[PDB]
Amino acid sequence: SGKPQYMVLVPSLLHTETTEKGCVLLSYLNETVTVSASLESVRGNRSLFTDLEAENDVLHCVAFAVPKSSSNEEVMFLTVQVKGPTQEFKKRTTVMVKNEDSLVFVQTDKSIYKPGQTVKFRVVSMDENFHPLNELIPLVYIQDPKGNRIAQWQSFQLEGGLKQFSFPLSSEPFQGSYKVVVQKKSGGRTEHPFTVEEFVLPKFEVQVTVPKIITILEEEMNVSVCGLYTYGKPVPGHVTVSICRKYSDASDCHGEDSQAFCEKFSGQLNSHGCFYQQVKTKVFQLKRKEYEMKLHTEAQIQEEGTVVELTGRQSSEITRTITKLSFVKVDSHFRQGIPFFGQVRLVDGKGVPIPNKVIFIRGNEANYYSNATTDEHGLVQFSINTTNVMGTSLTVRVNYKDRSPCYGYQWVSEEHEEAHHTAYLVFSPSKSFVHLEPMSHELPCGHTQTVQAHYILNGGTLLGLKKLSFYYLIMAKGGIVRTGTHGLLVKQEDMKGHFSISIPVKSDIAPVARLLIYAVLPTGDVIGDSAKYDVENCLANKVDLSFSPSQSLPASHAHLRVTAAPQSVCALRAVDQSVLLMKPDAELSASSVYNLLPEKDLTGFPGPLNDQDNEDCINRHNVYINGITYTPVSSTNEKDMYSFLEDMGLKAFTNSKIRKPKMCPQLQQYETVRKYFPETWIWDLVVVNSAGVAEVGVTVPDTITEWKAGAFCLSEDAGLGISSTASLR
Amino acid sequence: EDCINRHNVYINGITYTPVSSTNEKDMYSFLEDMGLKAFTNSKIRKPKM
Amino acid sequence: SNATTDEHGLVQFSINTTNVMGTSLTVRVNYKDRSPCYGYQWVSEEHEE
Numbered sequence A: 001s002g003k004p005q006y007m008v009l010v011p012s013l014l015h016t017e018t019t020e021k022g023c024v025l026l027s028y029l030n031e032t033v034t035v036s037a038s039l040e041s042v043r044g045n046r047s048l049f050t051d052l053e054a055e056n057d058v059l060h061c062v063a064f065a066v067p068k069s070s071s072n073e074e075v076m077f078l079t080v081q082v083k084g085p086t087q088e089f090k091k092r093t094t095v096m097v098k099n100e101d102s103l104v105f106v107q108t109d110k111s112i113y114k115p116g117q118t119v120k121f122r123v124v125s126m127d128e129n130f131h132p133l134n135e136l137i138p139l140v141y142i143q144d145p146k147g148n149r150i151a152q153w154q155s156f157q158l159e160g161g162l163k164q165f166s167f168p169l170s171s172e173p174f175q176g177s178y179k180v181v182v183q184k185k186s187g188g189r190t191e192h193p194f195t196v197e198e199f200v201l202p203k204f205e206v207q208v209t210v211p212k213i214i215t216i217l218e219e220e221m222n223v224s225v226c227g228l229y230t231y232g233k234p235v236p237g238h239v240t241v242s243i244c245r246k247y248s249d250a251s252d253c254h255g256e257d258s259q260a261f262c263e264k265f266s267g268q269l270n271s272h273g274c275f276y277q278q279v280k281t282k283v284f285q286l287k288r289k290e291y292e293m294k295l296h297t298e299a300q301i302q303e304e305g306t307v308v309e310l311t312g313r314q315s316s317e318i319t320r321t322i323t324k325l326s327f328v329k330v331d332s333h334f335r336q337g338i339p340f341f342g343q344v345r346l347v348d349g350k351g352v353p354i355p356n357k358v359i360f361i362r363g364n365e366a367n368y369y370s371n372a373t374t375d376e377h378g379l380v381q382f383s384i385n386t387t388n389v390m391g392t393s394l395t396v397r398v399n400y401k402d403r404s405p406c407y408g409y410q411w412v413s414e415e416h417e418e419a420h421h422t423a424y425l426v427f428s429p430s431k432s433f434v435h436l437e438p439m440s441h442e443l444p445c446g447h448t449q450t451v452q453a454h455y456i457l458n459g460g461t462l463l464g465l466k467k468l469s470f471y472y473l474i475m476a477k478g479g480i481v482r483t484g485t486h487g488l489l490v491k492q493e494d495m496k497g498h499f500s501i502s503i504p505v506k507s508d509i510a511p512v513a514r515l516l517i518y519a520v521l522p523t524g525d526v527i528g529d530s531a532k533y534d535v536e537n538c539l540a541n542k543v544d545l546s547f548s549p550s551q552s553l554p555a556s557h558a559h560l561r562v563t564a565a566p567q568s569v570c571a572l573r574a575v576d577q578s579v580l581l582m583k584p585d586a587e588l589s590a591s592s593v594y595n596l597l598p599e600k601d602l603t604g605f606p607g608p609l610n611d612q613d614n615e616d617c618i619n620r621h622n623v624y625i626n627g628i629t630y631t632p633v634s635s636t637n638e639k640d641m642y643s644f645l646e647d648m649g650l651k652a653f654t655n656s657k658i659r660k661p662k663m664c665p666q667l668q669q670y671e672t673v674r675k676y677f678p679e680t681w682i683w684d685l686v687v688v689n690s691a692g693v694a695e696v697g698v699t700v701p702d703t704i705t706e707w708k709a710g711a712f713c714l715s716e717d718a719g720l721g722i723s724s725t726a727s728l729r
Numbered sequence B: 001e002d003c004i005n006r007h008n009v010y011i012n013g014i015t016y017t018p019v020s021s022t023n024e025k026d027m028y029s030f031l032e033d034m035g036l037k038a039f040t041n042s043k044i045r046k047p048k049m
Numbered sequence C: 001s002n003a004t005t006d007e008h009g010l011v012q013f014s015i016n017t018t019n020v021m022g023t024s025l026t027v028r029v030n031y032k033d034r035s036p037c038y039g040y041q042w043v044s045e046e047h048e049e
Ligand SMILES: *[C@@H]1O[C@H](CO)[C@@H](O[C@@H]2O[C@H](CO)[C@@H](O[C@@H]3O[C@H](CO)[C@@H](O)[C@H](O)[C@@H]3O)[C@H](O)[C@H]2NC(C)=O)[C@H](O)[C@H]1NC(C)=O
Pocket: A336, A337, A338, A339, A385, A386, A387
C-alpha cells in the first residue's frame, strides 16, 4: 500500500548553543521509527545525539542547540541511524560546525575629520537575531597607518549591548585614513575607518553638468553650468567652456594634439536662476570614428580676474554598444509541463524604450516564435510552448542577428545589445512538479503573500490515493523560519495547477527567502525546487522622531520628540546633513546592518567538504538492457533533486531516490568634493519612557543648511530600532 | 533493402543507433556465414550499410 | 584465474561472463615490454602475447 520515505532535514551549519530549527519527513506508514542524528567523534563522545519520537504524516520541528566546539571549525561525520525495529541504515556526511560569533559594529559621526578635534564614536553588539547583547570585550583600539595604536580602551562591558566613546585628536596627524580595531574572544575583527584633513576649501564653486551616455544618433546636449563661489552669488559676468572631441585611437607617437574638435558655447553669466547652456552634438559629429570627448570649463571671475578652470565630467563615455536592452524577470530556470514567463525590457540613454517597439521573439528549439512589443515600462511577459528536450536557450530582437564581419581586424565596429538566454530543465521521475513564479518586484512588509505556483502530476497519479501531501519551507540564518503544509483534493487522473499557499511577511529571514516546496510521493521519488524571494528591509521596532519646528535661527530651545517601544536605549546623533550630503552613508543604513551581517546563507558545498560520497554508481545495475537497443550510461546537466536539498542549502538522509551521477573510480582502468562646516551638532544617549521621550534640542544658530539625525535606538523588549530618515531645515 | 531514413530517434533513453540489426555475431549473420538466404516473419534480414 | 601448462594438456579454461557484448581476452598479461627504456627508440622488445 505505502512504501515508507524518510528524510531528515539537517542544516550542516551549526550556530552554537542557540535554537536552530531542524525537522524530518515521514509518511506511507511502516512499523516503527525513532531515528537519531549522532555526530559521533572517532570515539563517540562528541555525538550531537538527538533521538526524538517520530511518526508519519507530521511536521514538528525541534530547534535543539549545541554546546561549544574545540576548534572554530571542525568536520565531523554524521550517521543518522534509521532506528527501525527491523531496519537500520546510515550515511555519513561531514557537519559544518562553526563556533560562530555574536555580531557587532561601530558608529561614528563621519570618516573624514578635522585636525585637533575629538572624534566621537560608539560601538554595538547583537546576536544572530536582531536583539541586543550585553557582553564584555577583550579590548579596543584606534590605529594609525604607521603600525601603531593611537587610542585604546581595555576590556569594558556593555550596559545595554553597546557603548559610546570619544577620542581627542591632534592638529598634526598624518593626512590619511585612520582606523579602529576590536577583537572578540575568538578574535572577531570589525573595522570602521576615519580620515582627517584640513585641506583648503576651494573658494570657487564652479559646477558643470553634461549628458553621460551617448549613442550613434543624438541632436542636443543640454548642458547646465553655474558657479556660485559662496553657493548664493552667481556672478554677473561671462563664462566660457572648453569642450573638445579628443582621443587619438590608442596612439601616442602622433606627436600632435589629438583634439578632433574644440567648441566654446560660451555665454554671459546671469544671476537670474543660473547660467545654463544647450550645445548640439552635430557639429561635434557624434560619429563612430569620431573619437572620445573631454570637458573643461573656463569660469572667469569679474572684478578679481583670478580665473579658475575645472575639468569635471570630462572623462567621456565610449558607448561601444547602442540600443541596450536586458532581461527583467527572466526565469533563471524553467520547466516542461508549462509554457513559462521570461521577461525583457529596454533602456537607451535617458532610459526610454520607443513606445510599441515590436520585437522578434527568438525563443527557439520549440521554434515557438511569436512577436510582441514593448509595454509602457519597456517590459514584456510571455509563455512559450513546451515539448522539447531539457536544454532550451532563448533570445529576442528588434534587429536581427549578423555574424557578418568582412575582415578579422574590424577596427570598424558596431554592436546592438541582445538578450539571449540559456536554460535547463527540472527532473520529473516522480511525475509531479510546480512552477513557483518569482516575486522579484516590490515587497512591502507586515503582511502576507499568497504565492502563485502551478503543480502538475504526470500520468495523473499512477495509483496515489485520495490524498497525498505537499509542504513549503523556508530557511533563515541557518534555521527554518516556519513550517508550511497543505493537502489537495481527491482525483486519480488529472493535470491540475490551482494550488493554494501563503506566508506572513514580517522579519526573521535572510535578505532572500530560498522558499522550497516538494512533491511527496509513495514511490520513492520527491520533486521540488527552491524559490528565492526578496526580503525588503523592515525592522522589529519602528520609530519616528520629530523636532520643535524648523524656523529662524537663534531659538536655542527646541525639541526632538521620538516615540517607539516603551523601553529602549537610544543613540541621538542630531547633526548637520550637509556633511553627510558631502559623503553619503555608503556605510550606514538599516539595510546596511542587514548586509553587514555575515553568514546569512552558506550552502552545506562550502570550503571544508569538497563533496559527499554516496552509495550507488553509474556503471552499476548490470542486468538486462533496453529491449529496443542498448542504452549505455550517461546523464543530464539539468537542475536536480539532491541539489534542491542544497538549493535549500542543507543536507538530509533518505531512501527516496537521488540516484544520479556520483562516479565510479577507474571503471576497467585498473574625487574632490565640496565641504562646509564639519561641526557636529548633537550627540547623546537617552532612554525612552513608556510614552516616547522628547529632548529639548539646542539650536546651533548662525549656520543654515540641511540638518539631520544619525540617531538609533535599541532594546530587547522590541529589538533594535531606527527611523532611518527625518531631516531638518 | 530497408529504404528507411530513420525510426523513433528521439527518446528519453539513449537514441538507438541502427535502423536494422548490425553486430559482429547477430542472428542473420548466422544465415550469412552459412551463405544462404531465406524468407521469414521472425527477425532476420537486413541491408548491410 | 591463473593456470599452468600440463605436459599432456594445454590450458582448458573458462571465465564467467556477467557483462555486455564488448569482451576481449589475453594471457601473459603482466607486461608487453619488459624494459620500456630499451634503447635509442630503435628496436622494440616484442615477445608474443
Ligand atoms: C502548448 O500550448 C498549448 C495550448 O495552446 C497546449 O495544448 C494543450 O495540450 C493539452 C494536452 O494535450 C490539452 O489537453 C487535452 O488535449 C487533447 C488533445 O487531443 C484534447 O482532446 C483534450 O480534450 C484536452 O483538451 C489542452 O486542451 C491544450 N490546450 C488547450 C487549448 O486547452 C500544449 O500543452 C502546450 N505545449 C506543451 C505540450 O506543453
